[PDB]
């Protein structure tokens, strides 16, 4: 009697992959000083 809705596993996989891809596409950073 251990159950979870499928829309939890299904949506978690999609959201995690998108957040992993966007971070992975960064090779350099530029930070501007406060005015």
């Amino acid at each position: 009697g251990v159950f979870e809705p499928t829309i939890v596993k299904v949506k978690s996989l999609k959201f995690a992959t998108e957040a992993a891809i966007t971070i992975l596409r960064i090779d350099d950073l530029i930070k501007l000083h406060p005015e």
Binding site: I23, I26, D27, D28, L29, I30, K31, L32, H33
Partner: protein, 55 residues
């Protein structure tokens, strides 16, 4: 620095990829102790002393 006078700090190469991974990794470690039926809870005390307990 020399070229690219931008008035700011820039990082390139392996410097920013490793730094990004640690920043992402540290977030997981905060909440890794709140998963599963054997998980536990946390307090979050602000400056004004208001207490909050949640996992």
């Amino acid at each position: 620095e020399g070229p690219l006078s931008v008035f700011g700090d820039r990082s390139t190469g392996e410097t920013i990829r490793s730094q990004n991974v640690m920043a992402a990794a540290s977030i997981a470690n905060i909440v890794k102790s709140s998963l599963g039926p054997v998980g536990l809870d946390k307090m979050l005390v602000d400056d004004i002393g208001d207490v909050t307990i949640t996992n």
